Write an enzyme that holds these catalytic residues in place. Structure first.
Site, PDB file in Angstrom:
ATOM      1  N   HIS A 102      45.206  44.198  43.601  1.00  0.00           N
ATOM      2  CA  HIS A 102      44.577  44.517  42.347  1.00  0.00           C
ATOM      3  C   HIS A 102      43.403  43.540  42.219  1.00  0.00           C
ATOM      4  CE1 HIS A 102      47.580  41.459  41.129  1.00  0.00           C
ATOM      5  NE2 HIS A 102      46.682  41.093  40.227  1.00  0.00           N
ATOM      6  N   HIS A 111      42.671  40.839  40.573  1.00  0.00           N
ATOM      7  CA  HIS A 111      42.768  39.403  40.342  1.00  0.00           C
ATOM      8  C   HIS A 111      42.326  38.536  41.495  1.00  0.00           C
ATOM      9  CE1 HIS A 111      45.609  39.941  36.693  1.00  0.00           C
ATOM     10  NE2 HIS A 111      44.338  40.012  36.363  1.00  0.00           N
ATOM     11  N   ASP A 163      43.439  35.986  43.078  1.00  0.00           N
ATOM     12  CA  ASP A 163      44.328  35.681  44.205  1.00  0.00           C
ATOM     13  C   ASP A 163      44.557  36.926  45.033  1.00  0.00           C
ATOM     14  OD1 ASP A 163      45.828  36.605  41.825  1.00  0.00           O
ATOM     15  OD2 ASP A 163      47.683  35.902  42.737  1.00  0.00           O
ATOM     16  N   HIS A 206      52.337  44.510  37.101  1.00  0.00           N
ATOM     17  CA  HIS A 206      51.790  43.209  36.794  1.00  0.00           C
ATOM     18  C   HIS A 206      50.358  43.351  36.351  1.00  0.00           C
ATOM     19  CE1 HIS A 206      50.139  39.255  37.348  1.00  0.00           C
ATOM     20  NE2 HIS A 206      49.223  39.824  38.111  1.00  0.00           N
ATOM     21  N   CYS A 259      52.016  41.108  43.883  1.00  0.00           N
ATOM     22  CA  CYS A 259      52.235  40.346  42.672  1.00  0.00           C
ATOM     23  C   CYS A 259      53.042  41.187  41.669  1.00  0.00           C
ATOM     24  CB  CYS A 259      50.885  39.831  42.139  1.00  0.00           C
ATOM     25  SG  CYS A 259      49.659  38.922  43.381  1.00  0.00           S
ATOM     26  N   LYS A 285      58.608  39.531  42.331  1.00  0.00           N
ATOM     27  CA  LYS A 285      58.819  38.084  42.195  1.00  0.00           C
ATOM     28  C   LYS A 285      59.883  37.669  43.232  1.00  0.00           C
ATOM     29  CE  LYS A 285      56.769  38.595  38.179  1.00  0.00           C
ATOM     30  NZ  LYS A 285      56.235  37.237  37.915  1.00  0.00           N
ATOM     31  N   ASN A 288      51.851  35.812  34.096  1.00  0.00           N
ATOM     32  CA  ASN A 288      50.650  36.287  33.378  1.00  0.00           C
ATOM     33  C   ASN A 288      50.719  37.751  33.032  1.00  0.00           C
ATOM     34  OD1 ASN A 288      48.102  36.730  32.316  1.00  0.00           O
ATOM     35  ND2 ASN A 288      47.124  37.038  34.316  1.00  0.00           N
ATOM     36  N   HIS A 343      53.835  35.511  45.106  1.00  0.00           N
ATOM     37  CA  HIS A 343      53.971  34.079  45.124  1.00  0.00           C
ATOM     38  C   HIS A 343      55.416  33.842  45.460  1.00  0.00           C
ATOM     39  CE1 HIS A 343      50.108  33.993  43.179  1.00  0.00           C
ATOM     40  NE2 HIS A 343      50.580  34.779  42.227  1.00  0.00           N
TER      41      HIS A 343
END
Ligand SMILES: [Hg+2]
Ligand code: NA
Ligand SMILES: [Zn+2]
Length: 226
Positions: free
Chosen positions: A78, A80, A82, A141, A160, A163, A172, A202
């Protein structure tokens, strides 16, 4: 076995064709982000980039020098940072990119680097024979978040949207569709029951339990907020 390829980027092999890296970046936190490196016929697909061009360059150079493969492909999870922080360098490097139209549009209105080919439902990029299948199964997310399935390898880079098993926070939720999140995760589990490895955004990777786990986190969030 984790292999430090830089003080900030470390890489870990999941199969002969697939690797997952972790790049760390000071921000929020000196937070770590995951991404993939899919190799075939000396061709590499980078799935997500490190926070920026520098890290991205270091990784791509390691893939070449060490993995003896040239990154010719890029797919972001997406919009973002990262996910696309190093897209500019890649474009500079001549890399073909594919992404959800939603991502392309957001990066666009955001003056952010723009992946060049855009799909809407699903897409399969043949990394010189190797199928990299992208799917937009719903909002999670981030509204545009996608997953990339490696059928040959039975590896899911859920991104993301998932998890790791140690995670306990929704994180976030600024660009997240909380209510959609659980249904997407439902569609993901149902769609890849063969996931040997499930790689999140992550944290450590695992199996399909990462899906149910993330879903536990989200549902609880939805309940905490009576
Ligand atoms: Hg990401
Ligand atoms: Na990443
Ligand atoms: Zn994000």
């Amino acid at each position: 076995k984790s292999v430090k390829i830089s003080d900030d980027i470390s890489i870990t092999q999941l199969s002969d064709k697939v690797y997952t890296y972790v790049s760390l970046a000071e921000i929020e936190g000196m937070v770590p982000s995951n991404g993939m490196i899919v190799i075939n016929n000396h061709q590499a697909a980078l799935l997500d980039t490190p926070i920026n061009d520098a890290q991205t360059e270091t990784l791509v150079n390691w893939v070449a020098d060490s993995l003896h493969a040239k990154v010719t492909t890029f797919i972001p999870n997406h919009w973002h940072g990262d996910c696309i922080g190093g897209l500019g360098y890649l474009q500079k490097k001549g890399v073909q990119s594919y992404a959800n139209q939603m991502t392309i549009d957001l990066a666009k209105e955001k003056g952010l680097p723009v992946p060049e080919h855009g799909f809407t439902d699903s897409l399969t990029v043949s990394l010189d024979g190797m199928p990299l299948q992208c799917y937009y199964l719903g909002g999670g997310h981030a509204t545009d978040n996608i997953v990339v399935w490696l059928p040959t390898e039975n590896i899911l880079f859920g991104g993301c949207m998932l998890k790791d098993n140690q995670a306990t926070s929704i994180g976030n939720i600024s660009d997240a569709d909380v209510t959609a999140w659980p249904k997407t995760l439902d569609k993901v589990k149902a769609k890849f029951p063969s996931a040997r490895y499930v790689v999140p955004g992550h944290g450590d990777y695992g199996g399909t339990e990462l899906i149910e786990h993330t879903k536990q986190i989200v549902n609880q969030y939805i309940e905490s907020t009576k």
